[PDB]
Write a protein that binds this ligand. Structure first.
Ligand SMILES: Nc1ncnc2c1ncn2[C@H]1C[C@H](O)[C@@H](COP(=O)(O)OP(=O)(O)OP(=O)(O)O)O1
Ligand SMILES: [Mn+2]
Ligand SMILES: [Zn+2]
Length: 1028
DNA sequence: AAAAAAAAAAAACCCCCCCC
DNA sequence: TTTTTTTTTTTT
DNA sequence: AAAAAAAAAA
RNA sequence: UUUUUUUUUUUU
């Protein structure tokens, strides 16, 4: 039983201070020059573990002191009664039993109330409860049925255990000592070498600021390593741990020896989805490292990520910051299309996946690669230190296995493992790119050979009968030195051949199974014929979404919960599909997706709130609603950003097939329009992107051709037949846009650097640039204030969050007129609401309470969600419009909520409660029903209390919506007490107690003063707060 | 000539919260 | 009464 | 410019 | 039940 740190223990103030004092005292009394700092850090970890155990035991003992004394007294009195029975002893025993039972009941009630409060704070939001409700039951780590060596099913725990441990020990024991072959392979091919500056950047001395940056970036709510310390321990005791962690890492840099804890890790076997559980090779051995080892490896990973852009080509986008997965997906789709349009089809596209990508990678080959990449000195010495004697023990069925060495492979679950694996696999990538014998597919003026995402490598070949053989020979050579293994049972290949004999020979020699219809690549069904992309990618997407809706039909969550479910689960999948393949989708797809989503949201019933109302911003609603057409436009127009940027790493841009003006995509945005050129007959992604960008620009009624962000390289300047050296000079000196050099009277005059730039340009081109720039049309078209749409694609140098900004701008642009239900409320009371009243009602809807249940109730009240006798009488085309619950009056919404003689006494009680709170609030239905206040009620010190009372009243009114019995004050008070308990524990957990007490103390005291003792005891209503 | 916006007509299902 | 779907008109 | 959560890929 | 990259949503 390995100890683990409980995060709730770190939130205790006394334990916090005691543990900080212990850390400081120990680490200033045990620090000396008679011992190394690695063993000192290990001893510090052991001492912290022991002190934490002692503190937890002390806390448990103190928390149960009163009950322990009571139970001791009860047992003693019971023994005395058994020996000699007395009446007073019986009375004392009964009283002690009653007190003990009351204390235990209070403790359990507090526990369940804390749990209910935590759930109620995130009842319908995008959070762990909703995702857990979506997901199936959590799979336990109890693997009990696994194939043995002799081919028979076994269930004996000892045999199961020994089979797993022996298999994984064998997996991590095969270390190759053929150093000469590795050196030869590295020397054969050319690899990048870091210069002196980058090497000194890697080997720079560690600073405490790096420790803080890494500690703050550590993910929370993650399982601790074998040492049992969580990331929260390092984040919370950060102030006293950065100096000693920094000194330990300095000792590591001077000596190169790591603490013994840095090596030990625990391997947890997750079953791989879509694979057979009973197979022992079908488990992913992730490793939980100590958070300090994770800190060191994350420092190292950041240091190498500083230069990962130079170390690794742009063909590889897995684990590489700043490049998306669809970079390779669109590129492969374009290559497939180019093959399909090829008159002679002699191409192959092999999707190769590495079997156990960096579980079979070689540490010696990795070290040799790092040496060959210029990585040497302190950084490489630390890298060699962390791979010196790795050791992992499998945590199997909750039992720690005896540890085995990691003589081979790279530990999974390590911050540095992806970067090092990418570095090692880049040797093979550059070998493939640099081997002229294997031929890539010549798309336009560029050659395309390979694209990588982690170990998912796709190779495009021409003349495959020799290219595939040479690629296999190269991969075998790489395997002989690095242990890289091809996952034959997952690797596939599209083989385009017009000769049956050559094709049959290729399947005869090639081990890859030739996919005839589709290849699953990064969750995307790459198609052999590119016209099948919609039918093999989006029709399955609709089928999957329909199945998920059918599975969630009986889910126990409301319409807000279902909207957030669609956002949390369905929406990312749709967005990923749109990003990977932004092909022109038929409107049938969007209508079907919207119908499925809306049927899911409203439980296959009629929509209570119009989808046009929810599709607006959160102002009209407060929870909004996904717009899949607008999201599709956002993803398809995001390519405009990559067009404008015109980066050298965007190969997926240039592989689009084209016959007229091949270099056109960089000259389309904020650039002169074509002369009705019929470019892009059959392009798949870029033509639709351009059409949608132009449509959006037309919708904005803005000129997208001559823009303040028009480049100097743009066709506007190029068509002047100016020398490209002038464009280079203007880009280097002044800037990249026309504004940077000025137009009109501002032509090369706003900056003294313009005078120097003028001397570097030919006078003919200077004259022509002056003539173009000082023209009236150019001056008015360029010297104008840019819009948000233009700023999205031009002023942002990073592609992070392009979809969100573009989608928000599109939701602003495509805003649709909707019928405001607040105006219907105004018509209901025969009174007029101003713009200020509408804003107040919408804001009250937005932030009546933090919890989404209270907000959902307020939204349903204000947005006329509830069903009424008048409305239902209309739907059934009957005449039963009489109010429910029985009054003889017409059942409008204002009647059901406010004016009914049955609900009216509840509102009179609410107003009495308001009255003894010294609140003079007018008897206006708008005040509770929508939160609309008179203009003179500017004071907000009573807003929250009134909101709580009114919304609890709405809750208890909806509780008995058509019930002939009238809503009562007691149920309203019970709902208020439930809300009070929830917000009390929420404030206790979220450190927001003062504001909660400010808006809940007087109301609670009046509740207690207006309730009898019998009601308080029966309904469990009592004060949770004191005098503070 | 095709895409997008707007207006008119029809159909809905007499509770509503709660439900981790 | 309110929402959705269809349809007819207008504009690029 | 922060935090939290979810999801996709590996 | 870990790691990297990316994406979105919500709260400011
Ligand atoms: N859930 C995960 N947690 C941690 N690391 C992961 C996870 N999924 C994938 N990886 C990392 C480690 C793998 O070596 C690497 C490549 O993933 P992947 O190709 O799916 O599997 P794999 O190469 O480990 O084995 P196999 O190809 O036999 O399924 O990505
Ligand atoms: Mn793999
Ligand atoms: Zn009534």
């Amino acid at each position: 039983t390995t100890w683990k740190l409980n995060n709730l223990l770190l939130n205790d103030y006394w334990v916090h201070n005691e543990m900080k004092a212990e850390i400081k005292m120990f680490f200033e009394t045990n620090e000396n020059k008679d011992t190394t700092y690695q063993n000192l850090w290990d001893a510090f970890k052991a001492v912290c573990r022991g002190k934490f155990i002692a503190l937890n035991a002390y806390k448990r003992k103190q928390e149960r002191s009163k009950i322990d004394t009571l139970t001791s007294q009860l047992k003693e009195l019971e023994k005395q009664e058994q020996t000699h029975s007395k009446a007073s002893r019986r009375q004392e025993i009964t009283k002690i039993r009653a007190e003990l039972k009351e204390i235990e009941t209070q403790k359990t009630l507090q526990k369940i109330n804390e749990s209910r409060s935590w759930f109620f704070e995130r009842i319908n939001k995008i959070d762990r409860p909703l995702a857990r409700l979506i997901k199936k039951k959590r799979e336990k780590n109890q693997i009990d049925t696994i194939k043995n060596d002799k081919g028979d099913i076994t269930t004996d725990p000892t045999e199961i255990q020994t089979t797993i441990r022996e298999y994984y020990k064998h997996l991590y024991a095969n270390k190759l000592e053929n150093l000469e072959e590795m050196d030869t392979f590295l020397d054969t091919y050319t690899l990048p070498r870091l210069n002196q500056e980058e090497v000194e950047s890697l080997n720079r001395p560690i600073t405490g600021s790096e420790i803080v940056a890494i500690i703050n970036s550590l993910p929370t709510k993650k399982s601790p390593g074998p040492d049992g310390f969580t990331a929260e321990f390092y984040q919370r005791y950060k102030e006293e741990l950065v100096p000693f962690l920094l000194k330990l890492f300095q000792s590591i840099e001077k000596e190169g020896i790591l603490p013994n804890s840095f090596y030990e890790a625990s391997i947890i076997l997750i079953p791989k989805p879509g694979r057979d559980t009973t197979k022992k090779e079908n488990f992913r051995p992730i490793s939980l490292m100590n958070i300090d080892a994770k800190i060191l490896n994350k420092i190292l990973a950041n240091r190498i990520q500083q230069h990962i852009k130079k170390l690794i080509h742009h063909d590889q986008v897995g684990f590489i910051p700043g490049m998306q997965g669809w970079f390779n997906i669109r590129k492969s789709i374009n290559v497939i299309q180019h093959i399909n349009r090829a008159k002679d089809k002699n191409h192959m596209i092999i999707s190769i996946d590495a079997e156990k990508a960096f579980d079979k990678i070689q540490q010696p080959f990795m070290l040799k690669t790092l040496n060959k990449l210029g990585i040497d000195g302190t950084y490489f010495k630390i890298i060699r230190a962390i791979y010196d004697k790795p050791t992992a023990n499998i945590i199997l069925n909750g039992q720690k296995l005896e540890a085995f060495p990691l003589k081979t492979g790279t530990r999974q679950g390590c911050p540095l493992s992806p970067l090092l694996f990418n570095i090692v696999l880049e040797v093979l990538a550059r070998a493939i790119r640099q081997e002229k014998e294997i031929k890539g597919i010549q798309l336009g003026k560029e050659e395309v050979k390979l694209s990588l995402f982690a170990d998912d490598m796709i190779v495009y070949l021409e003349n495959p009968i020799v290219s595939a053989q040479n690629l296999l020979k190269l991969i075998s050579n790489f395997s002989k030195v690095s242990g890289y293994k091809i996952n034959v049972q997952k690797s596939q290949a599209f083989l385009y051949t017009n000769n049956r004999q050559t094709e049959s020979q290729i399947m005869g020699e090639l081990p890859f199974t030739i996919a005839s219809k589709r290849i699953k690549y990064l969750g995307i069904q790459l198609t052999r014929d590119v016209k099948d992309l919609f039918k093999e990618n989006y029709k399955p997407l609709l089928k999957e979404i329909k199945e998920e809706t059918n599975k969630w039909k009986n889910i126990p969550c409301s319409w807000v919960g279902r909207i957030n479910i669609v956002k949390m689960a369905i929406l990312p999948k749709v967005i990923y599909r749109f990003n990977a393949i932004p092909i022109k989708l038929p409107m049938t797809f969007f209508t079907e997706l919207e119908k499925t989503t809306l049927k899911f949201i409203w439980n296959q019933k009629r929509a209570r709130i119009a989808k046009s109302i929810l599709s607006q911003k959160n102002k009209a609603g407060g929870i909004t609603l996904p717009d899949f057409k607008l999201y599709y436009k956002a993803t398809v127009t995001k390519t405009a950003w990559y067009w404008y940027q015109n980066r050298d790493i965007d190969q997926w841009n240039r592989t689009e097939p084209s016959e007229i003006m091949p270099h056109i995509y960089n000259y389309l945005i904020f650039d002169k329009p074509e002369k009705n050129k019929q470019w892009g007959k059959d392009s798949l992604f870029n033509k639709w992107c351009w059409e949608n960008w132009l449509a959006i620009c037309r919708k904005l009624k803005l000129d997208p051709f001559l823009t303040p962000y028009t480049k100097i390289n743009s066709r506007w300047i190029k068509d002047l037949n100016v020398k490209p050296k002038t464009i280079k000079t203007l880009e280097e000196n002044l800037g990249i846009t026309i504004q940077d050099i000025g137009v009109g009277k501002d032509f090369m005059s706003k900056t003294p650097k313009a005078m120097a730039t003028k001397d570097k340009i030919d006078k003919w081109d200077l004259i022509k640039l002056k003539s173009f720039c000082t023209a009236k049309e150019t001056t008015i078209r360029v010297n104008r204030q840019p819009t948000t749409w233009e700023k999205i694609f031009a002023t942002y140098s990073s592609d992070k969050g392009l979809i969100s900004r573009i989608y928000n701008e599109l939701k602003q642009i495509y805003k649709k007129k909707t019928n405001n239900p607040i105006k219907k409320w105004a018509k209901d009371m025969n009174r007029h609401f101003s713009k200020e009243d509408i804003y107040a009602a919408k804001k009250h809807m937005k932030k009546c309470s933090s919890s989404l249940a209270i907000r959902e109730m307020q939204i349903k009240t204000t947005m006329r969600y509830h069903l009424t006798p008048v409305r239902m009488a209309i739907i059934k085309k009957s005449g039963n419009n009489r109010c429910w619950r029985g009054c003889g009056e017409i059942g409008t919404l204002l009647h059901c909520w406010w004016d009914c003689k049955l609900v009216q006494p509840l509102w009179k009680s609410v107003w009495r409660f308001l009255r003894d709170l010294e609140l003079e609030i007018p008897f206006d239905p708008a005040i509770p029903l929508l939160g609309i206040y008179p203009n003179e009620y500017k004071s907000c010190c009573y807003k929250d209390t009134c909101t709580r009372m009114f919304i609890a009243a709405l809750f208890t009114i909806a509780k008995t919506w058509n019930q002939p019995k009238c809503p009562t004050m007691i149920d309203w008070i019970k709902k208020m007490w439930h809300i009070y308990t929830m917000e009390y524990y929420a404030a206790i957990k979220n450190d927001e107690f003062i504001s909660f007490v400010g808006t809940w103390m007087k109301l609670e005291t009046i509740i207690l003063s207006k309730l009898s003792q019998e009601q308080k005891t029966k309904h469990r209503i009592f004060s949770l707060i004191g005098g503070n």
